Design a protein around this ligand. Structure first.
Ligand SMILES: CCCCCC/C=C\CCCCCCCCCC(=O)OC[C@H](COP(=O)(O)OCCN)OC(=O)CCC/C=C/CCCCCCCC
Ligand SMILES: [Fe+2]
Ligand SMILES: [Mg+2]
Length: 656
């Protein structure tokens, strides 16, 4: 049929090239609020939004994450560009080569030729990338026509990653078939993280609470909870004869970790799995204290569960107390098991990735491409829909990485992470509110808290940027409430996005706070909780989301053998070292850059009022450079550098 004529030669590659070029053409349209657009503009933007709703589609029945608002599928223009594809393929291929090289030669035989070919093709692809960028710099006038060759390279790297996918599945099909030496052996040629040397140290263990992957749970305590019955004699055994619970509470020196919210991620008993044997996890309570000099936090006491009737109190022992040493190491391991569950499922997956999913969808469906807030927000969602589909499909099915690495049955893990996302309150989850609610917002009381102090620098810089940008387009609160696209966006965020606590936006100040939280969550918050993975979470003895043995049943009389029984099977350690290396090794885009991350790396902003010398954008960029210098200076004085919130290391979006 002559009506099939358009379909005869049309493929995904042509369509991607068309999308890529049309994006550049649409970036030049000057942005406007709907009520200030002309009638032709109102008509065109309404038509485009209606079309966008065909391809950006909400579902709450996405595979392996039921109940969580998700994109039904990833639109063509939301696949990662070739810069992200090469970086990620590079990391995965290198990890495969490293793994295969550690297998016995007879086992490696199944994979080594295929991995060598992938490694060769990847090097070829990088050479092409370098050469295309060489040609663009040599003949800038013809750079528009090079976009097509970049699109062709994208096709090639997509195909390579598809073949990597098959190889990884072939490896996992044979996983089973394929005393701390084993936890080093799984690294192969990779260097062990610094935590491997320090993990037994009590002060190191405490520092995780303020400078680790989960800086969000620690809170000041003024009176101990009824279900944590620590006595004064016990407290003085650790803190000295001239201290007391009363004195330490009054002087703001007591801090509590309580993992009650883990729910079914802390199974009530043993969970037996075919691939990993018998596994346990916990919802413990731990007390930390500052010395009177506030030099640093010290762990005082640990109860390995919520009910003191069934969980005895473990109190930090003196160095001489050899009979109490191993029970204490076991109690610390219990807390670290709770930590990987809480961090990965709640702080990372639920509260960054799965929140940003909803703001991405709302933004594409309700704010027109010519809306200044679409222009501002879209760079902060680059690669988000893609990486989250990856999470749901690759990491969360039965026998996948999360079923292996986390103790709970996979259905309970899926449901509990989902429930956490649905319960997460947007306003209460903002950094300054989080700090205030937990009473850890005062540097006099708790001086060494790098997440707070570096985090507030970035939060406030973003806030001032959102204020400057809003002020370009919205002259009054009436302009906010007159914006029909913003009102629709809020409607979808509440109704389809199910973001708890979200509310109508009725003025400029509130709009600024909302935008600050959206941008911070997409960029800095994700960076702070994602990029510690390779340096802090790759070594199983320092942290793992399952234990192979129950919590210690008594503080006294444990041996090294008792503690070793908690260590996970080698398969768990193998999946752990590889996934956490990958997820923290891809830095794609940078907060404040505001250029496309794919060729031709054009400016995000065309409006002269935004891009003016010394204007809103330049003020944000210069502020981030000051923040960078400030943090570098702080890290010279810190016991350990905390680098995760350096702006040079914060991607603009959540894409890994
Ligand atoms: C774990 C807790 C994380 C929680 C946070 C989750 C947040 C979202 C992160 C989502 C990340 C999604 C995971 C993929 C991220 C990589 C980016 C990506 O898009 O990968 C594309 C390819 C192809 O896709 P496809 O659909 O065609 O076929 C999937 C397999 N049937 O997938 C992979 O290579 C699987 C790599 C698995 C990791 C292998 C590690 C190295 C292998 C070394 C040897 C293996 C030794 C065992
Ligand atoms: Fe991530
Ligand atoms: Mg228990």
């Amino acid at each position: 049929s002559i009506f099939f004529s358009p379909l005869k030669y049309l493929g995904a590659e042509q369509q991607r090239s068309i999308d890529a070029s049309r994006s550049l053409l649409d970036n030049l349209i000057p942005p406007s609020l709907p009520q200030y657009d002309n009638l032709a503009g109102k008509l065109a933007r309404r038509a485009v939004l209606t079309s966008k709703k065909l391809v950006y589609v909400w579902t709450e029945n996405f595979a392996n994450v039921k109940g969580v608002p998700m994109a039904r599928s990833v639109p063509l223009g939301e696949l990662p560009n070739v810069d992200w594809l090469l970086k990620t393929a590079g990391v995965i291929v290198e990890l495969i080569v490293n793994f295969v090289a550690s297998l016995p030669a007879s086992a490696a035989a199944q994979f080594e030729r295929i991995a060598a070919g992938l490694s060769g093709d990847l090097e070829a692809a990088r050479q092409v990338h370098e050469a295309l960028l060489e040609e663009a710099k040599n003949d800038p006038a013809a750079a528009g026509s090079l976009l097509l060759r970049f699109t062709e390279l994208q096709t090639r790297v997509i195909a390579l990653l598809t073949r990597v996918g098959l190889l990884v599945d072939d490896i996992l099909k044979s996983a089973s078939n394929l005393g701390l030496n084993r936890f080093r052996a799984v690294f192969g040629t990779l260097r062990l993280p610094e935590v491997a040397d320090s993990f037994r140290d009590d002060e190191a263990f405490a520092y995780w609470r303020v400078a680790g992957p989960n800086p969000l749970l620690i809170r000041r305590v003024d009176a101990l909870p009824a279900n944590f019955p620590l006595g004064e004699e016990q407290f003085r055994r650790v803190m000295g004869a001239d201290d007391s619970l009363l004195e330490a509470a009054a002087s703001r020196r007591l801090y509590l970790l309580d993992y009650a919210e883990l729910g079914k991620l802390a199974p009530s008993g043993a969970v037996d799995k075919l691939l990993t044997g018998t596994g346990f996890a916990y919802a413990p309570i731990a007390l930390f204290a500052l010395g009177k000099d506030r030099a640093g936090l010290l762990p005082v006491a640990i109860q390995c569960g919520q009910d003191p009737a069934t969980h005895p109190m473990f109190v930090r022992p003196a160095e001489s107390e050899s009979d109490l040493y191993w029970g204490w190491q076991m109690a610390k391991t219990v807390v670290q098991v709770a930590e990987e569950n809480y961090h990965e499922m709640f702080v990372h997956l639920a509260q960054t990735h799965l929140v940003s999913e909803a703001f991405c969808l709302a933004t594409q469906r309700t704010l027109a491409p010519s809306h200044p807030l679409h222009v501002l927000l879209a760079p902060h969602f680059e690669g988000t829909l893609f990486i989250n589909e990856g999470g749901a499909r690759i990491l969360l099915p039965s026998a996948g990485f999360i079923d292996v690495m986390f103790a709970a049955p996979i259905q309970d893990t899926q449901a509990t992470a989902g429930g956490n996302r649905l319960g997460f309150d947007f306003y209460r989850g903002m950094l300054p509110e989080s700090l205030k609610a937990r009473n850890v917002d005062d540097p006099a009381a708790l001086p060494d808290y790098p997440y707070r102090d570096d985090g507030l620098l970035v939060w406030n810089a973003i806030r001032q940027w959102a204020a400057d940008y809003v002020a370009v387009y919205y002259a009054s609160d009436g302009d906010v409430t007159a914006d029909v696209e913003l009102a629709a966006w809020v409607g979808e965020v509440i109704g389809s996005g199910k973001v708890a606590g979200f509310r109508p936006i009725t003025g400029r100040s509130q709009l600024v706070e909302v935008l600050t939280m959206v941008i911070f969550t997409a960029s800095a918050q994700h960076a702070a909780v994602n990029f510690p993975q390779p340096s802090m979470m790759t070594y199983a003895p320092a942290i793992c989301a399952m234990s192979a043995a129950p919590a210690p049943d008594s503080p006294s009389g444990k041996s090294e053998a008792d503690w070793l029984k908690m260590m996970p099977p080698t398969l768990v350690a193998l999946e752990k070292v590889n996934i956490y290396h990958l997820l923290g090794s891809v830095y794609h885009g940078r907060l404040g850059d505001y250029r496309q991350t794919g060729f031709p790396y054009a400016p995000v902003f065309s409006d002269r009022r935004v891009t003016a010398s010394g204007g809103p954008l330049e003020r944000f960029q210069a502020r981030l450079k000051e923040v960078e210098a400030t943090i570098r200076t702080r890290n010279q004085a810190r016991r350990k550098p905390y680098e995760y919130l350096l702006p040079s290391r914060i991607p603009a979006s959540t894409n890994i």
